[PDB]
Amino acid sequence: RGVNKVILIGNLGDKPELRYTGSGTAVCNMSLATNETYTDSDGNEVQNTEWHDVVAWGRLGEICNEYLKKGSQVYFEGKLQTRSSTEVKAQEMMFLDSN
Amino acid sequence: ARGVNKVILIGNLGDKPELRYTGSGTAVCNMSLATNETYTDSDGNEVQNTEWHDVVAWGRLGEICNEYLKKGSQVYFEGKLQTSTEVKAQEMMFLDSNRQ
DNA sequence: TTTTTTTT
DNA sequence: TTT
């Protein structure tokens, strides 16, 4: 009855932080920086870093906590949602950090 | 691009769009959009999940939103996340126009 | 806080 | 669905 999709490509601001709920469900909280770089009206470069709170639950949360490092380039697809603040609940994750 | 920040929403406004102007006279339109999701309970019961989103449209797009959108209007939005967290609308489609 | 009409 |  509705579409709620978010797509993010950027780098992690810090190591993923894995926690567990009272019910023992894995929750992984992450900060992703998407960088927009644009020259403005006076030919002056301006860098505008957007920070995003990304949340991964269950297996995906633990996979993220295992393989993702501070500064890792990563693709995320998920839902927009607000809880407790506004966050992206990850549904898909793709490593873009290969060598 | 040095990054990808893309948001896509289909939903219904919860209220009339609200348009205001900045000190520079630039049109700013704020909206509240709802995306509904329905699933089944542990007991198999229907359970509605609703997410509300603050959507902002600037300039001409902001005026077009204020001009055609109303309470309950079904609408497609496409934009970027900005953080208070907001979806800045870059693209909009009125979905209650050509339904059949 | 507030939205949803045939239909998954 | 869920810190």
mmCIF file of N, CA and C in Angstrom, chain A residues 37-40 42-47:
data_model
loop_
_atom_site.group_PDB
_atom_site.id
_atom_site.type_symbol
_atom_site.label_atom_id
_atom_site.label_comp_id
_atom_site.label_asym_id
_atom_site.label_seq_id
_atom_site.Cartn_x
_atom_site.Cartn_y
_atom_site.Cartn_z
ATOM 1 N N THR A 37 30.055 16.982 -3.514
ATOM 2 C CA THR A 37 31.027 18.037 -3.767
ATOM 3 C C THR A 37 30.591 18.870 -4.960
ATOM 4 N N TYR A 38 30.303 20.142 -4.711
ATOM 5 C CA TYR A 38 29.812 21.021 -5.760
ATOM 6 C C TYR A 38 30.475 22.394 -5.713
ATOM 7 N N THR A 39 30.937 22.858 -6.869
ATOM 8 C CA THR A 39 31.394 24.232 -7.005
ATOM 9 C C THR A 39 30.165 25.128 -7.045
ATOM 10 N N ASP A 40 30.243 26.300 -6.425
ATOM 11 C CA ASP A 40 29.081 27.178 -6.368
ATOM 12 C C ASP A 40 29.166 28.336 -7.359
ATOM 13 N N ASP A 42 30.555 31.189 -7.339
ATOM 14 C CA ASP A 42 31.793 31.951 -7.464
ATOM 15 C C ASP A 42 32.980 31.063 -7.823
ATOM 16 N N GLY A 43 32.691 29.864 -8.316
ATOM 17 C CA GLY A 43 33.732 28.924 -8.687
ATOM 18 C C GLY A 43 34.439 28.338 -7.480
ATOM 19 N N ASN A 44 33.817 28.478 -6.315
ATOM 20 C CA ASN A 44 34.391 27.978 -5.072
ATOM 21 C C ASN A 44 33.852 26.600 -4.705
ATOM 22 N N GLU A 45 34.750 25.625 -4.615
ATOM 23 C CA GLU A 45 34.376 24.270 -4.222
ATOM 24 C C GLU A 45 33.787 24.238 -2.818
ATOM 25 N N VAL A 46 32.668 23.537 -2.673
ATOM 26 C CA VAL A 46 32.044 23.345 -1.370
ATOM 27 C C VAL A 46 31.784 21.863 -1.133
ATOM 28 N N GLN A 47 32.270 21.350 -0.009
ATOM 29 C CA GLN A 47 32.082 19.946 0.325
ATOM 30 C C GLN A 47 30.979 19.789 1.366
#
